[PDB]
Amino acid sequence: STGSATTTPIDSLDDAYITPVQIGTPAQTLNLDFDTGSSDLWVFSSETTASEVDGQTIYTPSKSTTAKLLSGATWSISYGDGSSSSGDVYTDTVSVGGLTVTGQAVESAKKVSSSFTEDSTIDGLLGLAFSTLNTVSPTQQKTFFDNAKASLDSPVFTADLGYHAPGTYNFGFIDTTAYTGSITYTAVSTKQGFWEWTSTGYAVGSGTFKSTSIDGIADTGTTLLYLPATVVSAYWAQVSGAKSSSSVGGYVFPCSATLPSFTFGVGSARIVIPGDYIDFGPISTGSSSCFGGIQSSAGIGINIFGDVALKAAFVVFNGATTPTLGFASK
């Protein structure tokens, strides 16, 4: 089997991407944030505290003839941005782009933090990291990809995120028309539960490539590119007027600037992020100070290849017995 679904930016900045997902019988379609940095599929639901729902579409398990309460199971998750959610668990039929999994754990939110309530475009998350990170207790549950893997033509999914445009998540096949050149594969460590890999270095603009190992995660659920402070300083030093602002929470730059590109290494290959991808617009409406798309990881504990980086490539999440990542230009 295979699946193929279009993923669409939630706003004009590509702050996140939503992908339609069919849950239950008859289908209830929710727009979920596919997140290769976490491992829970959770949804706004008929059980979510009413004051914490503001425009989202909700899953109502009582209207699904295939929903079954997973007795005793609870979940609770906190994300790197400080947001959180928690609730109980059903199993139900879940389909993505024509690919169907029966008995998928669907985590029903009883509580969500303010940032989820405030984002009416995201109806939940669909985690695609390794199932060892799933938060369901007392019986940990498998991700949608883990459950579908055995049925897929090939044990892979791909992320092809667009810049200011829709893109695609494919399951079970590699669309050879979706990228240019060849795909370069690189080793993955699953020891932290992430799609964790080591980039071979970077360049700023037309500058020379610096060979240096940068361990980080491929995370479709993080908007920006978070790298060591040395790398980020070298980037922003090439932008007149750019500075790190403690009051804003990162590097800002004059909105009048033209940003240089940023290149990262995948083995001997190179992925180029155009400068425009690094512009996240005014810090507040009408401001001439703009927020940068490359930020320091120094306060995180891990480097994060988020959407800013991933949308410059066609990315293969290879879930073979020994997982690997593949990157191609496009």
| Domains 5-174 and 175-330 equal at CATH topology level | yes
Tokens of 323: 């997982």
CA–CA distance, 206 with 210 (Å, rounded to integer): 12
Pick from 140, 118, 16: nearest CA to 70: 140
Give the DSSP H or E segment for 230: helix 229-236
Told to judge if 219 belongs to the known catalytic residues of this protein, a careful annotator would answer no
Considering the candidates 35, 92, 160, 219, report the single residue annotated as catalytic: 35
CA–CA distance, 276 with 230 (Å, rounded to integer): 22
CA–CA distance, 76 with 86 (Å, rounded to integer): 4
Experiment type: X-ray
Can you give the residue ranges of every domain in the chain?
5-174, 175-330
Compute how many other C-beta atoms are within 10 angstroms of the C-beta atom of residue 122: 21
| Residue 325 near residue 315, CB atoms below 8 Å | yes
Tokens of 239: 């932008």
Q: Give the CATH class of 5-174.
A: mainly beta
**Strand, coil or helix: 149:** helix
Residue 205: which region, alpha, beta or left (left: phi > 0; alpha: psi -120 to 50)? left
Told to judge if 54 belongs to the known catalytic residues of this protein, a careful annotator would answer no
When the candidates are 3.30.230.10, 2.40.420.20, 2.40.70.10, 3.40.50.10860, the CATH number that belongs to 175-330 is 2.40.70.10
Burial class (CB in 10 A: 0-12, 13-18, 19+), 163: middle
Residue type, 197: W
Question: Euclidean distance between the first and final Cα of the chain, in Å?
Answer: 25
Maximum CA pair distance of the chain?
60
| Residue 128 near residue 134, CB atoms below 8 Å | no
Considering the candidates 131, 199, 261, 296, report the single residue annotated as catalytic: 199
Resolution in angstrom units: 1.4
Extract long-range pairs of 286-291: CB within 8 Å, 24+ residues apart.
287/255, 288/254, 288/255, 288/256, 289/245, 289/248, 289/252, 289/253, 289/254, 289/255, 290/252, 290/253, 290/254, 290/255, 290/257, 291/248, 291/250, 291/251, 291/252
Question: Which are the contacts of 105, defined by CB distance < 8 A and separation ≥ 6?
Answer: 41, 70, 73, 89, 90, 91, 134, 136, 141, 142
